[PDB]
Amino acid sequence: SLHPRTLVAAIVVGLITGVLGAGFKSAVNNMLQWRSQLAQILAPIPPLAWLVTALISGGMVALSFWLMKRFAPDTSGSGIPQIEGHLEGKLPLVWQRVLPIKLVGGFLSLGAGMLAGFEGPTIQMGGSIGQMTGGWFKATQENQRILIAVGAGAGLATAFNAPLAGVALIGEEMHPRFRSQTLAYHSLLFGCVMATIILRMIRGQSAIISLTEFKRVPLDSLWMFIILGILFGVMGYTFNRGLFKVLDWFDRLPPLATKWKGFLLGSIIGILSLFPLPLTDGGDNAVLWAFNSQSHFSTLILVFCGRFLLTLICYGSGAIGGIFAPMLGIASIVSVAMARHFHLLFPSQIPEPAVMAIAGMGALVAATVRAPLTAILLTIEMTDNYFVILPLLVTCLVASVVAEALGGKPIYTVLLERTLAKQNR
Amino acid sequence: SLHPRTLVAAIVVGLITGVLGAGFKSAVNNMLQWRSQLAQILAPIPPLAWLVTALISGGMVALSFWLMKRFAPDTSGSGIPQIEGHLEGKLPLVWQRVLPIKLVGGFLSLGAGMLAGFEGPTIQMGGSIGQMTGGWFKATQENQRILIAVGAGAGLATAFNAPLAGVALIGEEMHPRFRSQTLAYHSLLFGCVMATIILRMIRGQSAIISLTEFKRVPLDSLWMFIILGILFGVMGYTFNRGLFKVLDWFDRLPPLATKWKGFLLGSIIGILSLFPLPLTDGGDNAVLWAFNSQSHFSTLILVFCGRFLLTLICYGSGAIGGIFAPMLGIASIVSVAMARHFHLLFPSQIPEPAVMAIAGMGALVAATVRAPLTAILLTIEMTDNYFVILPLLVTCLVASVVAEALGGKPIYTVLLERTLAKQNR
Ligand SMILES: [Cl-]
Numbered sequence: 001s002l003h004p005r006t007l008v009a010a011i012v013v014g015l016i017t018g019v020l021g022a023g024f025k026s027a028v029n030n031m032l033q034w035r036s037q038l039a040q041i042l043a044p045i046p047p048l049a050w051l052v053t054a055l056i057s058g059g060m061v062a063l064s065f066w067l068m069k070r071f072a073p074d075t076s077g078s079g080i081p082q083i084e085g086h087l088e089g090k091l092p093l094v095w096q097r098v099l100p101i102k103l104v105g106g107f108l109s110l111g112a113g114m115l116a117g118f119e120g121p122t123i124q125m126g127g128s129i130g131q132m133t134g135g136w137f138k139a140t141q142e143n144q145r146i147l148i149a150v151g152a153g154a155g156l157a158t159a160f161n162a163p164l165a166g167v168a169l170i171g172e173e174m175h176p177r178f179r180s181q182t183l184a185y186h187s188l189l190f191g192c193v194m195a196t197i198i199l200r201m202i203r204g205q206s207a208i209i210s211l212t213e214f215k216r217v218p219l220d221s222l223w224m225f226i227i228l229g230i231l232f233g234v235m236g237y238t239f240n241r242g243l244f245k246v247l248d249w250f251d252r253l254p255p256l257a258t259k260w261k262g263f264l265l266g267s268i269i270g271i272l273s274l275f276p277l278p279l280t281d282g283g284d285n286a287v288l289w290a291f292n293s294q295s296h297f298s299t300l301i302l303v304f305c306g307r308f309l310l311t312l313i314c315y316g317s318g319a320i321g322g323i324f325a326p327m328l329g330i331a332s333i334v335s336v337a338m339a340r341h342f343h344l345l346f347p348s349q350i351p352e353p354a355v356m357a358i359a360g361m362g363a364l365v366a367a368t369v370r371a372p373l374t375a376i377l378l379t380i381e382m383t384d385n386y387f388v389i390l391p392l393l394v395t396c397l398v399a400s401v402v403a404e405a406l407g408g409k410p411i412y413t414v415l416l417e418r419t420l421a422k423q424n425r
Numbered sequence: 426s427l428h429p430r431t432l433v434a435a436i437v438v439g440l441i442t443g444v445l446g447a448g449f450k451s452a453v454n455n456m457l458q459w460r461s462q463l464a465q466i467l468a469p470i471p472p473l474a475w476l477v478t479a480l481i482s483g484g485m486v487a488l489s490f491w492l493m494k495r496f497a498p499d500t501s502g503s504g505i506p507q508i509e510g511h512l513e514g515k516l517p518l519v520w521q522r523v524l525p526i527k528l529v530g531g532f533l534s535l536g537a538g539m540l541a542g543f544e545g546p547t548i549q550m551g552g553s554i555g556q557m558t559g560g561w562f563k564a565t566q567e568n569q570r571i572l573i574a575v576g577a578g579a580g581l582a583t584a585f586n587a588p589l590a591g592v593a594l595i596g597e598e599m600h601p602r603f604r605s606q607t608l609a610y611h612s613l614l615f616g617c618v619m620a621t622i623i624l625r626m627i628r629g630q631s632a633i634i635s636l637t638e639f640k641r642v643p644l645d646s647l648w649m650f651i652i653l654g655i656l657f658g659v660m661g662y663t664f665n666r667g668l669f670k671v672l673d674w675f676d677r678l679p680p681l682a683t684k685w686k687g688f689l690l691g692s693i694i695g696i697l698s699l700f701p702l703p704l705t706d707g708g709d710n711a712v713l714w715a716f717n718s719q720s721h722f723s724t725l726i727l728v729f730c731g732r733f734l735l736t737l738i739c740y741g742s743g744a745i746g747g748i749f750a751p752m753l754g755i756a757s758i759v760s761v762a763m764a765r766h767f768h769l770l771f772p773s774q775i776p777e778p779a780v781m782a783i784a785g786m787g788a789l790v791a792a793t794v795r796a797p798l799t800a801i802l803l804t805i806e807m808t809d810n811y812f813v814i815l816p817l818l819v820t821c822l823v824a825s826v827v828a829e830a831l832g833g834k835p836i837y838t839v840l841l842e843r844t845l846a847k848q849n850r
């Protein structure tokens with residue numbers, strides 16, 4: 001029941017966000033390693049670098065907070081809420097403000113080593129482009145919502161080289177109307193495909209962490225992932241609660257504290273960037289650290305607590321963030337620790353314990369977001385592994401059920417109610 | 426925003442349809458091979474077996490057509506249209522009539538070697554069980570809709586050992602309301618999980634055809650799949666158009682022709698079962714024939730025509746069928762031939778030509794059905810291969826577009842319009 005003019009528009013949307021998302025990630029990574037190489041040049045003598053890396057990080061983050069307001073406080077935090085809202089009625093979206101501020105601002109935040117969060121910027125920048133090209137194409141009212149949704153989806157696909165995930169995002173979480181043109185699915189797929197094709201031409205083509213050869217997953221091992229789900233259930237519950245309490249604390253000023261909040265917060269992160277441990281940055285490193293670098297079980301617990309708190313502090317401060325990746329890093333660290341433990345206890349049912357690490361990789365996301373279907377897809381797409389689906393399905397949706405059984409609520413719908421409460425920012 | 430009582434109900438649903446779907450498949454295969462062995466015992470002398478297999482097949486299909494009307498004509502054909510219908514208002518669904526007749530009748534049809542169609546009986550039987558258990562649990566109105574959808578998804582998941590597929594089905598095609606409890610997603614997943622778990626305990630655990638090690642898919646090969654799509658586009662177009670014409674012809678009686686239609690149509694199929702080619706039965710054989718048994722490029726063209734026509738006659742006759750598998754066999758036969766051809770022409774861009782076969786495997790489904798997202802997931806789920814996603818995406822959704830650009834109309838919504846036109850059967 002689809003319509004051409006809108007499909008070609010999607011081709012354009014996904015194409016643009018693809019180029020941007022890819023270049024954005026590349027840009028952020030360049031800045032990340034540049035600050036890492038600067039710390040080593042000065043490393044020899046002595047903690048001089050301690051001061052230098054502290055300034056650069058603190059300065060960037062502060063400069064980022066400034067570029068936020070005044071200019072577009074709308075770009076604060078994730079991006080799912082702002083687009084989920086606009087797409088629904090409440091809250092506006094103006095690309096001329098979001099696009100440049102989210103980009104330049106997001107670059108400063110992430111590049112400084114903040115605990116975010118590529119999908120943050122790339123998802124809002126996606127929606128912006130979707131809208132910006134919606135006008136260029138003189139799209140109808142409904143069609144423009146679609147184009148914005150496509151951008152949002154393409155945004156996620158670009159951050160993780162995960163087409164299906166981006167598509168599922170709009171579908172499950174952020175369920176929009178589309179009336180009656182529900183065949184915005186085509187627009188989505190189109191937008192996502194292009195985005196990743198460009199994403200792969202620029203930095204592709206491989207996945208984030210391909211673990212394709214772990215395929216032995218016995219059926220009488222499933223009971224385990226129920227427990228693993230129960231675990232990520234309460235974990236997601238406290239993560240949400242904690243986030244909100246840290247969100248309040250940061251809302252409570254004082255006017256002076258806020259002025260320094262930008263610099264102080266960014267300078268500590270800069271210090272923690274130096275230690276040889278993945279307790280900063282987006283979370284990709286954290287995942288690429290759980291697997292594969294074998295490290296002391298204690299160090300796992302150590303880095304888990306560090307990141308779990310630090311992400312709360314980082315996102316809680318309201319910096320240009322993005323919470324997806326950080327929860328992937330936290331989960332993958334926990335799932336590895338749990339993988340080891342269960343292999344310890346029932347090796348005959350967990351021959352390859354990597355299976356479990358993979359299963360719980362998207363479990364935290366499913367619990368905190370109420371979006372198991374997308375969390376499942378996400379991990380599949382970023383491990384090229386479908387063999388782990390049964391454990392995946394069980395752990396992810398049991399984590400989701402247990403979370404909203406303790407009454408946790410979708411982190412994004414709450415994050416929206418709050419950003420709405422700022423109808424006087 | 427989900428509620429417990431229904432979730433566990435979904436667990437039970439998926440559990441039941443899983444066992445039934447599994448047993449049904451096993452029961453049909455036993456019958457299939459039994460007739461094949463019966464043909465070989467009498468094979469030596471001489472075409473005596475020609476007559477016996479003709480009677481057994483013809484009789485079964487005839488007895489099948491009889492058990493249909495009068496008893497439950499609602500069970501004629503697929504199952505998506507009947508569940509898509511009920512789930513939407515038009516058309517009622519009574520489990521006490523469908524469940525038994527769809528089963529016993531479907532066994533006779535499929536067991537006789539008809540060009541169908543596991544996802545036919547299993548998807549309707551699922552919907553029945555979904556309702557059947559909804560009543561037992563005293564589920565509310567909306568909740569009972571959900572359970573019926575859960576049953577339908579589980580039905581598909583059981584036929585192909587493909588959880589996500591059964592989920593994507595309800596989502597993309599057959600888009601229901603669920604108001605505002607859109608978290609029937611959890612119910613779907615839960616139901617599909619249990620379904621495949623049971624399915625894997627009974628006949629699992631391997632996929633239908635795991636081509637997991639073909640993973641070299643160069644980016645400058647996508648242009649090929651754009652063509653492969655165009656091809657499957659017009660293919661799905663004429664397949665739809667053809668089906669409808671054959672349906673009309675069969676609708677035009679005469680009263681006497683119908684009396685024999687069952688026996689005649691079932692007896693010809695009986696004969697064709699003897700030849701050593703996959704030109705009868707569900708379609709799994711046809712797929713497990715494209716790959717891997719290397720066979721003459723001519724024989725491919727032969728079996729393709731045979732099945733493409735025979736499926737139209739079979740389903741067109743209105744026997745208890747199922748159209749998904751048949752369109753998988755036809756497609757995979759074509760995509761394999763196409764794979765060979767493109768490998769012949771541009772080997773540097775199609776290193777592994779299996780990639781092309783895998784891609785166009787669900788393309789016919791995506792064109793005739795308008796449901797590319799589910800066609801994609803289906804192929805991934807039944808090959809364990811995610812590496813083939815970009816081709817998959819392009820080839821499928823391009824094929825979906827091209828079909829509904831020549832004006833094809835979703836085969837299911839049309840099949841539903843026709844069944845509604847029988848508001849007096
Ligand atoms: Cl995010």
Ligand SMILES: [Cl-]
Nearest residue numbers: 503747748749
């Ligand atoms: Cl079907």
